Amino acid sequence: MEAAHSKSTEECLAYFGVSETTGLTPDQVKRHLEKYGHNELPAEEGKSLWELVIEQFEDLLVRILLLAACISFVLAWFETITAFVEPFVILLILIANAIVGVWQERNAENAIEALKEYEPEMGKVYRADRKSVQRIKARDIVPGDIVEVAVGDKVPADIRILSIKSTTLRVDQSILTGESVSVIKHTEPVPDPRAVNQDKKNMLFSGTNIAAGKALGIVATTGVSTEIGKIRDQMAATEQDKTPLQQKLDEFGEQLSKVISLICVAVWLINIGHFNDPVHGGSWIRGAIYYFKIAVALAVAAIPEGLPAVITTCLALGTRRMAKKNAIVRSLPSVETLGCTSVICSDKTGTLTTNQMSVCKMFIIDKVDGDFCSLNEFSITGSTYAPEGEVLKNDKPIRSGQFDGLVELATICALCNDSSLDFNETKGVYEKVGEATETALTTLVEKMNVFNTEVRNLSKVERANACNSVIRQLMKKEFTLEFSRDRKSMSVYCSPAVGNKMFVKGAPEGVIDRCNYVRVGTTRVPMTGPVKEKILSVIKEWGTGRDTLRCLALATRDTPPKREEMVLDDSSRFMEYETDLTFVGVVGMLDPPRKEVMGSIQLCRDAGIRVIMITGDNKGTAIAICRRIGIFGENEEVADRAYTGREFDDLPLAEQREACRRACCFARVEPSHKSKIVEYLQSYDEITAMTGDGVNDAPALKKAEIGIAMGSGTAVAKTASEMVLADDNFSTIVAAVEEGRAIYNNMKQFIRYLISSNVGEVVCIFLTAALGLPEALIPVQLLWVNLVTDGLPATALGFNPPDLDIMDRPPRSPKEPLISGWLFFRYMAIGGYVGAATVGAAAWWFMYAEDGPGVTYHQLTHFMQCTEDHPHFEGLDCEIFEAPEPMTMALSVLVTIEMCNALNSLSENQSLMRMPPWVNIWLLGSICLSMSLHFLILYVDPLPMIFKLKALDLTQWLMVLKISLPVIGLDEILKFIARNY
Ligand SMILES: C/C=C(/C)C(=O)O[C@H]1C(C)=C2[C@H]([C@@H]1OC(=O)CCCCCCC)[C@@](C)(OC(C)=O)C[C@H](OC(=O)CCCCCc1ccc(/N=N/c3ccccc3)cc1)[C@@]1(O)[C@H]2OC(=O)[C@@]1(C)O
Ligand code: NA
Numbered sequence: 001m002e003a004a005h006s007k008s009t010e011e012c013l014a015y016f017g018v019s020e021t022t023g024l025t026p027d028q029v030k031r032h033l034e035k036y037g038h039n040e041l042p043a044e045e046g047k048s049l050w051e052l053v054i055e056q057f058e059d060l061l062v063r064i065l066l067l068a069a070c071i072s073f074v075l076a077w078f079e080t081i082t083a084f085v086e087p088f089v090i091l092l093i094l095i096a097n098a099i100v101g102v103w104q105e106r107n108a109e110n111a112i113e114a115l116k117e118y119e120p121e122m123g124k125v126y127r128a129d130r131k132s133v134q135r136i137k138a139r140d141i142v143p144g145d146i147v148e149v150a151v152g153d154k155v156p157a158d159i160r161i162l163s164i165k166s167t168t169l170r171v172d173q174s175i176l177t178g179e180s181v182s183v184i185k186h187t188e189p190v191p192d193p194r195a196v197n198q199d200k201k202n203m204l205f206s207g208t209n210i211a212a213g214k215a216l217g218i219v220a221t222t223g224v225s226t227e228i229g230k231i232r233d234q235m236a237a238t239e240q241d242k243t244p245l246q247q248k249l250d251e252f253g254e255q256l257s258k259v260i261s262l263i264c265v266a267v268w269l270i271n272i273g274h275f276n277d278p279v280h281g282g283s284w285i286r287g288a289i290y291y292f293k294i295a296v297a298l299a300v301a302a303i304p305e306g307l308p309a310v311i312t313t314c315l316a317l318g319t320r321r322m323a324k325k326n327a328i329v330r331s332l333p334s335v336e337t338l339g340c341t342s343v344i345c346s347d348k349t350g351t352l353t354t355n356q357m358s359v360c361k362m363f364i365i366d367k368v369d370g371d372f373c374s375l376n377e378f379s380i381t382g383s384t385y386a387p388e389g390e391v392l393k394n395d396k397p398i399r400s401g402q403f404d405g406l407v408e409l410a411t412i413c414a415l416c417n418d419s420s421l422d423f424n425e426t427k428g429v430y431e432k433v434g435e436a437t438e439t440a441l442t443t444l445v446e447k448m449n450v451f452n453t454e455v456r457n458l459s460k461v462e463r464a465n466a467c468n469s470v471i472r473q474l475m476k477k478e479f480t481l482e483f484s485r486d487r488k489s490m491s492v493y494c495s496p497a498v499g500n501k502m503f504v505k506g507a508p509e510g511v512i513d514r515c516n517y518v519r520v521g522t523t524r525v526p527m528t529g530p531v532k533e534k535i536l537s538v539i540k541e542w543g544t545g546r547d548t549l550r551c552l553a554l555a556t557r558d559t560p561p562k563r564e565e566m567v568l569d570d571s572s573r574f575m576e577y578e579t580d581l582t583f584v585g586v587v588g589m590l591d592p593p594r595k596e597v598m599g600s601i602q603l604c605r606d607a608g609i610r611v612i613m614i615t616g617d618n619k620g621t622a623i624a625i626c627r628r629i630g631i632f633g634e635n636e637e638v639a640d641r642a643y644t645g646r647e648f649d650d651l652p653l654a655e656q657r658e659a660c661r662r663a664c665c666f667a668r669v670e671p672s673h674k675s676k677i678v679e680y681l682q683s684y685d686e687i688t689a690m691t692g693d694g695v696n697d698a699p700a701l702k703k704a705e706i707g708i709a710m711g712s713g714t715a716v717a718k719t720a721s722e723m724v725l726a727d728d729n730f731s732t733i734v735a736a737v738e739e740g741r742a743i744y745n746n747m748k749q750f751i752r753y754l755i756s757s758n759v760g761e762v763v764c765i766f767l768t769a770a771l772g773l774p775e776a777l778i779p780v781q782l783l784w785v786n787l788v789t790d791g792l793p794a795t796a797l798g799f800n801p802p803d804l805d806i807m808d809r810p811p812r813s814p815k816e817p818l819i820s821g822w823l824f825f826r827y828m829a830i831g832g833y834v835g836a837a838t839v840g841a842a843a844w845w846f847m848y849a850e851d852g853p854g855v856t857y858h859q860l861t862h863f864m865q866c867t868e869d870h871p872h873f874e875g876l877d878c879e880i881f882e883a884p885e886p887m888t889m890a891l892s893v894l895v896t897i898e899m900c901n902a903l904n905s906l907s908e909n910q911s912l913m914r915m916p917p918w919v920n921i922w923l924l925g926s927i928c929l930s931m932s933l934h935f936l937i938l939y940v941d942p943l944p945m946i947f948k949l950k951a952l953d954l955t956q957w958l959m960v961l962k963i964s965l966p967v968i969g970l971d972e973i974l975k976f977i978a979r980n981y
Pocket of ligand 2 (some may be wrong): 258704
C-alpha cells in the first residue's frame, strides 16, 4: 500500500485480505514474496580488485607509461645489469599508484551500505501457521504481515499501526530527522494522501526505534518501497561529477596523446631523407632501437610522474590543517571544489544559532475597558538554562508573585511541559532534558519564583527543578494532548489536590483564534476586537522586529469538557478540546545566532559567496533573522528573495528555477525541497554546499557538490557528506572555503612548475631525434627529476604564503584553465629554452669541451656511422658517443634550470626583485636537498652507473651555470611584459 496512512485499519486489512488475529496464511506469504520481493535493500555491487586495477590502467597517460615500460623491457632484453632498471622503475611507479588507488577505495565508505545498519536482523510476526508470535528474519517479512513491535525493537518495515496494546506508543524517528524527541503514535487515519512523514501519526517507518509502548500493525511496504528505501533509490541515481582538476587531467591526457603522436610524425617527416639512404647497412637494427628508446624517453619526458604524489600530499596536509579548524574533510579531491563554493545553503537552529533557547520577553493583559487596553510586558535576563536570572519591567527588578497574571502564566509553563532541567557536576553547567523550547519554560518559571519560595539555601541540583516542583504539587497532570502541526498547539488536563482546568500552549495565531475570553489578573473578560489586535500587534513586533523572538501563546480552558466525553486517542479531536479558551499571556524566547556567524556572512559577501538560510520558522521571523545576521539589509526589499514550502510549490517549474537564483531564505521547507533547490542552483552552474543531519537530508547531501554534515548528526548523513563540522558551526564552512582557495592557489603553482618541466624535457628529446644526436637525457634520469629533484620544490611550493585578498575575490570558475593566454606562451619560451639548453650542454662536451673529444657536428649527427671508422670519422673511439660525461651536462643544466624555474614559480607575474625568493623558507631548503641529491647520484659509487653519469669538474659546473641562470632573466622579462603591458 503506497498510501496506507490515509486508509483506515479496516481498509488496509481488506486490501491484502489478512485477518488481524490469524495473520497471513502460508500460501499468502508464498505469493506476497514473489510479488513484492524480500524486505531488504539491494546489496552493493562491489568492484573486484581486478576491476580497480583495470581502472588504474584505464587512464591514457598510465597506458602510455605501460607501453613505454614494455618497449623498455624488450630493449633491455636485447641490449649490462643496469639495463633492466629503467623498465622496473617505470613499472614500480604504476604498481604503487594502483596500490594507492586500491587502498583509497577500500578506505572509502558508502552511505547506501550505511543505510543497512538500520535494517534489523529479526522481526516478530503473527501468521496463520502458529497461534503464538514468531520471531523470523526481517528479510522474510512481506507486505500484509501482522507485525508486533515493543520497546527496544527496531521497526523492520513501513507498518500501518492497527492497535496499540499499551497505554501510549512513542517512537524514536531520529534517523530520519536527527537528534529529536520521541513522537506519539495513534491508529486513526490521516486524511491527506500527500502528507509528509512527520504527519503520518499512524505509521511506523523502517529503521526507527520504539521508544516506549507496544503495538500491533500491518506491513504496508518493504524493501526499496519503504521511506528509507525511497531515499536509497535517490542516492543510487545521484551521479558524482568529477572535480574540475580531475576533468583537467582527462583533458591534459587526451591532448598530450595528440602531441606525442604528432611528434612521432614530425620526427619521421624531418628524417625522411633516410628513404634515399642506401639499403645495404647494419644501421637499421640500430635505427629501430634508436627511435624506440627515444619513444620511451618521449613518454617519460611528457608525463609528470611526480605530480600526483605532490597533489595528494598537499591535500592530505590541508586536511590535517582543516581538522584543527573543526573542518573534517573526508574526500581529498573535494578540497578543490571547496574553494569553488558559490552558494552555501545552511540550516539555522544547529549551525547559524546556538540552539539554546531562553525566554527574553513576556506580556500579560493588564486592563481591558471597552476600547481602551493595556498590557504588562516584562523582560527576563539570563541566556542559559541556568535558573540564575531576573524578571524586569521597564528595566526594574520585580517580584513575579505580585502580578496574578504571571502566577497563571508560570503554572502553564510548568505543567504544559514535557521537559525538565538537570545539573551536571562534571561540567558545572545546568543541562537540558528534552526540547529546547520547553526547557526554556522550565528555566523561566525558576527565574520567576511566583510563589516566593526560598531557594537561596537550596543546592544547585535542587535549584534546577524547585519552583517547577512546587507548581507540580498544586495540580495533577491527568493526561496530555500532544503537539500536532495541524493545530500547532499542545495542552494538558489538570485537577487540583475548584473544577478541573486545561493549560494550552502553541503558536499565537492558532491559540488566540480559539480564545473567547481574556485573563485580567484573576478576573475574566470576553475577548474583543481592540484586545485581540493589541495582542497580535506585539506578536509581530517580537517576531519581525529586531528581537527576532519565537512567540508562544499561553491560554487556559476554565470550563474543560467532562472527562468521560473526551476520547484521548483521536488526535483529530484535540483541537476541539482546545476551544473556548481564555488568553493568559504570550512568552517569547530567542535562539541567538553564534558570535562568529555575523562576520562569516560578511566574508561570504566579500568573497562573492551567496548564503541561503533554511529554517522551520514562519516567513516573517525567518526574514527577520536574516536581517539580523546580515543576509538581508534592515530596509532591503525581499519580496521575491524569500519563499516558504507552500509558496515554492505553488510556483510553476519555470518560476521555481528563477526563484532559486535570487532567493536567500527558505522557511518551512518540504523534505523534497533541499534536492530541488540544489538542482536549480546546478542548472545555473552554481557550486552548491548543502547542510543536513538526517537520512532525509542524505539524498540532498549527495546531489549537492559539497554535502556538509554535523558532528552530532547521524552516521548516514556523515557518510553521505564531503565535510563534517566538528562543532556544528557555520563559521567552520567559511573557514574551510577560505582554506580551500588557499590550497588551490599554491596547488595551481607547483602544477605549472612540474608541467612546464615536462614541456622543456620534450623539446630536449624532440631536438635529439630531429637532429640525430645521441641521447642527452635517459628515461632513468628523467624519472629521478620528475619524482624527486622537482618533486621536492613542488611540495615546497604548496607552502607559499596565501594572498591577503583571497576572500575579497569572487569564487574561481571551474572551467578556468591552469595555463592559457600569455602564460601559455611563457612556458613555451621557457620550455623552448630548457630543451635547447640541455641539448646544447651535451653537444658542448662532445664538440667544444677541452676535457672532451672535439667532434664535427656532422659526425655527431651521423655518429651511428662511427662503426665504419669512416674517413669522414677521425678514427675516434665509437664508445665516446656513449660517454657518460655529456649526459651530466644536460642533466645538471636541467636540474639547475628547474631549481631556478621553481624560484620563478613563487609568483605568476610579480618580479623576484619585488617578491624575493626568500619569502618561502621551505622552497630554499628543498632546493638545497634536491641539489645534494644530485651530488649523491653523481658521486656515491653505486648510483652513477645506474643513472649513466659521471662527476663534473669545477670548470664544467660554471658552464652549467652560465646556461641555466639566464632562465631567471628570461622569465623576469616575460613577467615584466605582463605587468606593465
Ligand atoms: C606535457 C608536455 C608537452 C610537450 C605537451 O605537449 O604539453 C601540452 C599539453 C598537453 C597542454 C599544453 C602543452 O602544449 C604545448 O606546450 C605545445 C608546445 C609546442 C611547442 C613546439 C615547439 C617547436 C600546456 C602544458 O602547454 C604549456 C605551454 O604549458 C598547457 C595546458 O596544460 C595545463 O594547463 C596543464 C594541466 C594539468 C592538469 C593536472 C594534472 C595532474 C596530474 C597529471 N598526471 N599525473 C599522472 C600521474 C601518473 C601517470 C600519469 C599522469 C596530469 C595533469 C594545456 O593546454 C595542455 O593541454 C590542454 O588541453 C591544457 C589546457 O591542459
Ligand atoms: Na555530494
